Amino acid sequence: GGFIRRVTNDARENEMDENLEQVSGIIGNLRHMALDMGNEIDTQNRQIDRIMEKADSNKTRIDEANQRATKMLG
């Protein structure tokens, strides 16, 4: 509805203007969706470091515990 320089009064031109307007609004929604998706995924990726550091710390603590228990065996 006013998205292009209309060169004719045809129904074909009228459909073209509405179809382009609908495409443009979906792209504008996708722009904001991509920004939300990037914000959530970056936060989630750095959550993996938080989980991994805790996982290696507990695995190393279990190695210490296994070594400590094994050293009381004789």
Place this chain on the structure above:
Amino acid sequence: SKQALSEIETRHSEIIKLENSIRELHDMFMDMAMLVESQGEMIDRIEYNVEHAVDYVERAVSDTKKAVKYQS
């Protein structure tokens, strides 16, 4: 000045370019959707190995608490 055939033929040329700009974005979404879904299949292995480790820890700590109790 302004001429109708030149405007429509040029406009059609930019519209087919706009479709191919969207086509690259579409190709990226389909590959990204496959990859994040495929990574989600891998996370099931990580989850089960961790949950099975929780069963071993829950048993091991319980038995360790039983073991220490015999020291008077």
Place this chain on the structure above:
Amino acid sequence: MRNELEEMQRRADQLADESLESTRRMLQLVEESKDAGIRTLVMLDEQGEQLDRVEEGMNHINQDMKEAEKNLKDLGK
């Protein structure tokens, strides 16, 4: 003569009809892209639902290991 008008009108008509075909295809392609986008975003959040359970298991390992650590340190007498 011919190339004063008559050729131009049919050239414009063909360009306009293939333009309808591109715009209709493009509108469906962008909607298809949103449908894939929404699935991807919901899948990303529900992978976060899975991830808090992984940290919940680590927190449970930490809780019982923290009790175990005292017993292991007092044990070796």
Place this chain on the structure above:
Amino acid sequence: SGGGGGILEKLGDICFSLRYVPTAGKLTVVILEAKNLKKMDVGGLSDPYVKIHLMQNGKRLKKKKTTIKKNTLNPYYNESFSFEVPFEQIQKVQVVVTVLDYDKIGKNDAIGKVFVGYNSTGAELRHWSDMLANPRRPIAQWHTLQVEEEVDAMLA
């Protein structure tokens, strides 16, 4: 089910219950027991588990999974999954059920699969029709597993 090629290769039989409420739009799927599964590894014992994916006109949406039941070809689950589907939109969807073995190496192959929803015949069609018709149905039905590309060919 057992009119496919999976009877010849002895893939196994799985029992489950489907129930819907058309007025409130809520859908519940319960996976019960399975019996006589095919063993994938040669010398080990299989650890079977099920992944269940919701689809719209053959287009994938989201999925959920059972707990793993180790060292058996007759697993007992009794596990419940609940969803929401509008009444005008239950007449646009399919549910796909895939059973797999648990080996830690990766690149896991499916034991077999089955689906319920439109584009089906016999037992699969009946269970979906029964689910839609009857609010809070407690009844369950057995389905024999089928090979992947037979399911693809049937669905198409």
Place this chain on the structure above:
Amino acid sequence: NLTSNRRLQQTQAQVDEVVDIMRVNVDKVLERDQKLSELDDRADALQAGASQFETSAAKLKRKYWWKNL
């Protein structure tokens, strides 16, 4: 004045802007892949260490039974 095509040019700019963000986002899927790959090895090591720890605890229970007898 006669209607002009800035809105069509804006529509191209909107797709051009989101594609640049998506190129950064896919490299962050590769960032996720590397981190998950490392996590997988840690998960086996945690599971393997947990089995050893339980078996060691069972030995320790038998040892401390003998110690206090």
